[PDB]
């Protein structure tokens, strides 16, 4: 038999299982862990959940090629993706790992729910600390970013927007001499040019005000 085993990097590798009905200890031993280490073993269910495998919990491998996350750790943190609970043996999780676990398509935007301010957008390489109190909740939305042009909010479909295209979409003639200054939240306004590129992924809604 064969199984696929990965770690916090989620890079699966083939492992040979000589028993069709192993328990957590056998899966841990086949993955290269001594009995005293007791790694955390998480079986990837077909629906999308992760089932914790005890050292004496027999797993039926005759079904199909099952996948496991075997990470030497002494704890597990619970988080959620769209209300579905998931388990993670490490306290720091990257956005890429969240997308891998939740099977979120790359055409969507990942957010971390907050109550005291706007929900935080999580990039691929951004690290979220799960050790914070409470269950961290993640959300998938449509990949659209808002921009406040002349006091009106327009919803672009790209993380980065050319200022000329933004003005064109707003309706103003880009060819006129404009004093363009951007006002990112929490930062002073910075003058820009008609042909510059604005990254909307910064937290909050940017304000692209124009004057003649
Ligand atoms: Ca057995
Ligand atoms: Ca179990
Ligand atoms: Ca919120
Ligand atoms: Ca937490
Ligand atoms: Ca923004």
CATH of the domain at 195: 3.10.20
- Beta-strand (E) ranges in the chain? 2-6, 13-16, 40-44, 50-52, 67-71, 77-81, 84-88, 92-94, 108-112, 120-121, 127-129, 136-142, 145-149, 152-156, 160-162, 179-183, 190-192, 197-199, 206-211
Instruction: Judge contact between 118 and 109, C-beta under 8 A.
Output: no
Tokens representing 58 are 């027999």
Instruction: Kindly list the protein residues that place their beta carbon closer than 5 angstroms to ligand 4, a single-atom ion.
Output: 130
What is the structure's resolution, reported in angstroms to one decimal? 2.7
Residue with the two structure tokens 């696929």: 4
Which three-class secondary structure state does DSSP give residue 155? strand
The H or E element containing residue 95 is: helix 95-102
Cα separation, 171 vs 5, in Å, equals: 55
Q: Verify that 115 and 156 share a domain, yes or no.
A: no
C-alpha–C-alpha distance, residues 106 and 95, integer Å: 11
Q: Which domain holds residue 130?
A: 78-142
Domain termination residue (choose one: 101, 123, 142) = 142
Same domain, 4 and 25: yes
Closest C-alpha among 32, 3, 96, 50 to residue 41: 50
Which of 30, 57, 74 is the last residue before a domain boundary? Answer: 74
Same domain membership, residue 69 and residue 1:
yes
Residues 66 and 1 occupy one common structural domain: yes
> For residue 24, which ligand has an atom nearest its CA?
2
Ligand nearest to the CA of 117: 3
User: Would you say 10 and 69 are in contact if contact means Cβ atoms under 8 Å apart?
Assistant: yes
SS3 210: strand
CA of 112 to the centre of ligand 3 (A): 8
Which residue has 């790694």 as its token pair? 39
- How far apart, in whole angstroms, are the C-alpha atoms of residue 99 and residue 105? 7
Looking at 20, 53, 74, which one is the last position of a domain? 74
Verify that 115 and 136 share a domain, yes or no: yes
How many other C-beta atoms lie within 10 A of the C-beta of residue 42? 23
Nearest Cα residue to 97 out of 110, 114, 84, 107: 110
Q: Are residues 84 and 136 in the same domain?
A: yes
Same domain, 27 and 60: yes
Residues 84 and 70 in one domain: no
- Give the method of determination: cryo-EM
What's 41's domain CATH number? 3.10.20.90
Q: What is the dihedral of CA 29, 35, 36, 42, to 10 degrees?
A: 50
Distance between Cα 111 and ligand 3 center (Å): 10
**What count of residues does the chain have?**
212
What φ, ψ does residue 112 adopt, rounded to 5°? -110, 125
User: How many domains, the chain?
Assistant: 3
Say how many Å lie between the CA of residue 137 and the centre of ligand 3: 10
Going from the Cα of 203 to the center of ligand 5, the distance in angstroms, rounded, reads 5
- Looking at the fold, whether 128 and 171 belong to one and the same domain comes out as no
Residues 131, 188 within the same domain: no
If asked whether residues 56 and 82 sit together in one domain, one would say no
């Amino acid at each position: 038999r064969f199984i696929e085993v990965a770690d916090e990097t989620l890079s699966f590798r083939q492992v040979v299982m000589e028993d069709s009905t192993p328990n957590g200890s056998q899966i841990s031993a086949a993955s290269g862990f001594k009995p005293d280490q007791m790694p955390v073993v998480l079986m990837l269910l077909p629906n999308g959940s992760l089932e914790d495998i005890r050292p004496d919990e027999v797993v039926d491998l005759s079904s199909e090629v099952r996948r496991f996350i075997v990470v030497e750790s002494d704890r597990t943190y619970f988080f959620t993706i769209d209300g579905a609970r998931l388990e993670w043996p490490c306290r720091f999780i990257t956005g890429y790992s969240i997308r891998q676990l939740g099977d979120i398509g790359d055409n969507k935007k990942l957010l971390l729910e907050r109550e005291d301010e706007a929900d935080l957008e999580v990039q691929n390489d951004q690290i979220i600390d799960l050790d914070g109190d409470g269950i961290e909740r993640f959300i998938s939305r449509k990949a659209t970013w808002k921009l406040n042009i002349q006091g009106k909010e327009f919803t672009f479909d790209t993380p980065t927007v050319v200022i000329r295209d933004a003005v064109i979409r707003a309706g103003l003639n880009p060819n006129q001499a404009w004093h363009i200054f951007l006002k990112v939240e929490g930062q002073p306004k910075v003058e820009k040019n008609i042909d510059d590129v604005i990254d909307l992924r910064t937290p909050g809604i940017e304000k692209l005000r124009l004057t003649p």
